[PDB]
Structures are given as structure tokens and as C-alpha cells.
């Protein structure tokens, strides 16, 4: 089981099945393989990764498959990344080639920028031997910035095989992707979908910002398998039609990247009693995710906050005696690109074993891992210590809060109090009373000093470009 081989076998079985769909733009398995070989011909000899630029054109997938076959790999760059960071990336990468999959012109200080047109009308042969090997760097994905992470081809093959076993909805399914391709969550949709003959359906930024457009896309395609961040799922729960009775095609979900709120999982389990729902956790540095747990009624009833589950093959998890989880194994990245200090500082791979220090406080209780917080988001107030996420979880377990993020406030380089930005369960008609009620509701769940002074009621929490809660942008609304 090899990525190119399963895709090619499926393309040979069903050349006219759709491999990729972005609104009306469709790409069949035959064209995905045809155009990917043509790109590989233009790409061969290249021992530098191909920059992959665009948003949601199906030719981004062409780019990925082409970069795999030529063996040089790719660096996915989404149009939502600021231009100066794009310049920084192309500069670090030293590409020979840049695939501009958008309609507008792109130009790059390094390498040859070509368009889809160069491939649509290329005359190069449509058969090309894949020359990737296990230890090649298949992709380099850059960190959010909350450095380019390098991933071995074998890590990807392994990760996809894991997703294929976790998948209970079979082959030839309609898959949904939300993550931009510069966010490795999309990998969790791209390759398990193509490796099982599915159709990768692309949600773009516009759909994320204008939910009526998302609703339209959902009505045009009956989605079966859904891969997204928890925050995106939370937003889509406000589509009332999105339930098992009215949208019965949808029966499997994979979430990664953020804490999955117990309330959100509860609602989804309620509205799709038959769906296979997985919570997964992992950093970019260990190939997308390393744990999974199926969320059921029992998992909900029995776990006040959800675990992230058990480790996968290629990922041996251990916990340092301060609680920092460490991942060892094939899932571990080779390291950040031409950034030796940043690599030494969290990566230890000596004697051929590979280890990554995660920065998340994790705890293992009765067969299951829990992610409690990012080490940085730990506060001492009144000489006491909780993880910011824990405070936020306590706020979410309150009938007046539908969603909540907590902002520490500082001076003289030390936290002074907390402000809670709240999406309330009800529009907050009155200002004094809700502050009163949230604080009183907290008497049970929090020691006084960890209850925020202020609340800032927000209609909606802003999301990052990757679909996570935008902490920085939430800070700015509070800070003046
Ligand atoms: N299911 C989950 N539950 C709780 N936390 C999660 C889950 N999945 C991922 N995380 C968090 O997301 C982190 C991985 O995020 P990602 O690799 O996409 O970028 P980042 O670490 O958020 O930002 P940066 O690019 O600055 O590192 C993990 O370190 C963990 O903190
Ligand atoms: Mg990280």
C-alpha cells in the first residue's frame, strides 16, 4: 500500500469518477493522474521542493500528486498567507519551480512561475514513473506562527493507512475538506479520500465567511465524511438543516487542531446518532495527528471533557515528569528547514530514533490521553496555577455561555486579572445581570481568583485563516 499506487488503481477502475470538486470546477481521477504526470515531466530532475500556490483550485491537488511523482515534494502556500511571509518562505525554500494555480499573475524571486495553462496544454506524456522514496521529504508545511515542518513520505503513507482503517464509511465517499492546504489538517482529508476513491469536496474561504454559500455547497453535494476544525464544526451547527434526518448522507466526522468542546460534541452526537465521530490530536511536527477516539454517547456521558484517545502506529507517546507529552517514532518530522536552532530545541533524533517535545500538558488516565493546555497558556494568579484552557472549559460548562475565550491582562510582565470574551447562549439583553449570573454560576466550578473580573460579550468569535479560534484578534478587541 503506496499512495500513488492506490490512487492509480482507482483511476484505472473509474477514470470518470470525480476525484476533486470545488464548486462547479471538477477533476476526474483520470485527469488528476494525467495532469499530474504532465507536471511531473516538467518537474523532473528537481531536487528542490515545488512551491504550491493557490487556494482551492483542484489543480492544487494536481500539484501535490505531481510533486510526489517527481520525488521533489512540495511546499503548500495558501492565498491567505500574508505576502511578506510568502516571500520569506520562497526565500528559505530556494525553489526551482512555483505552481501558480490562481488566475492572477504571481512572480517569485526564486524559480520559474508557471500556471495551470502550462499543464492543460502541455504535450508531455501522461505516464510517469513515480520516483519518490520512503525517506524523501514529501511536503514542508509552515507553522502558523501562534518555520517549515518537514515530513517523510513514509510518515504520510503510514498516516493515510491509519485514516483508512479509522474510516468506517468505505470507499467512493463524498469527503469534505475545510483546512487550507497550508494547514496540515487538509492532509487528513486529501490523502485518505484519494486513497479510497472518494471525491474531495473543497470548502473555500468565501464559504467559511458567508454561510449561505456553505449551505448551498452542502445542498449541491451530499457529504458523507467531514474533516474540519472544531470551531468550523461549531459554526456549521448553526445551520438548522444540518442533522441526520435532513442531511442523511453525512455519517462520519474527523476533527483536529483544537479542543473539541463537550457541548459541541454533545450536539453533533444528538443530531447524528448514527455518525462515526472521531476526536483526534496531534501537532504538525508529528504528521497531522497521533491519537483518535470515537466520541459516543458513552464517551460523552462518562467524560466531562473529552479525551483525545490512544496513540497510533508510528507515534509512541510518553509524558515527561512535568507533564509535557513527547512523541517518538515514524510520525515525527525530520525537522524544520534550514533552522538548526529551532530544531535542536524541541527535536531529539539520535541513534535513528525520532522524538518531538510537544509543549502541551498531557495526562494519561485509564487508557486515554487528555490534552489539558498549551504550556504557554498557563497562568499564576494568587500564586495558583491553571491552564487557560481549563478556565475556558469551566466557562463553557454554564448555561449562559455558548462559547468562551479568556484573556490574561498584564503589567510589569505579570498577569493582573482575566477578562472573559463570551458568546452567550442568549443575546445579552442586559449588561449588569449577565456578569452577575456568569460569576455566580462559577461559584461551583472555579476558585474565586480564577474567575474573571470582566466579561466582553461577542456575537461571534473570530477565526484564524486555518479555522481555529483567533486568540490574537480576540486580544485586540479587549486591549483598548
Ligand atoms: N484534539 C485536540 N485537543 C486539544 N488540543 C489540540 C487538539 N488537536 C490539536 N491541538 C493543539 O494544536 C496544536 C497543534 O497545532 P498546529 O500544529 O496546527 O499549530 P500550532 O502549534 O497551533 O501553531 P504553531 O504553528 O505556532 O506551532 C497542538 O500542539 C495542541 O496544542
Ligand atoms: Mg506547533
Residue numbers in the entry: 2 to 147, 152 to 485
Give verbatim lines from the article.
d-Alanylation of the teichoic acids of the Gram-positive bacterial cell wall plays crucial roles in bacterial physiology and virulence. Hence, the d-alanylation pathway has emerged as a promising antibacterial target against drug-resistant S. aureus. d-Alanylation of teichoic acids is mediated via the action of four proteins encoded by the dlt operon, DltABCD, all four of which are essential for the process. Similar to other adenylate-forming enzymes, DltA utilizes several distinct structural conformations to catalyze two sequential reactions: (i) adenylation of d-Ala at the expense of ATP followed by (ii) thioesterification of the 4′-phosphopantetheinyl (Ppant) prosthetic group of the d-Ala carrier protein DltC. Here, the crystal structure of DltA from the methicillin-resistant S. aureus strain Mu50 is presented, which reveals the unique molecular details of the catalytic center and the role of the P-loop.
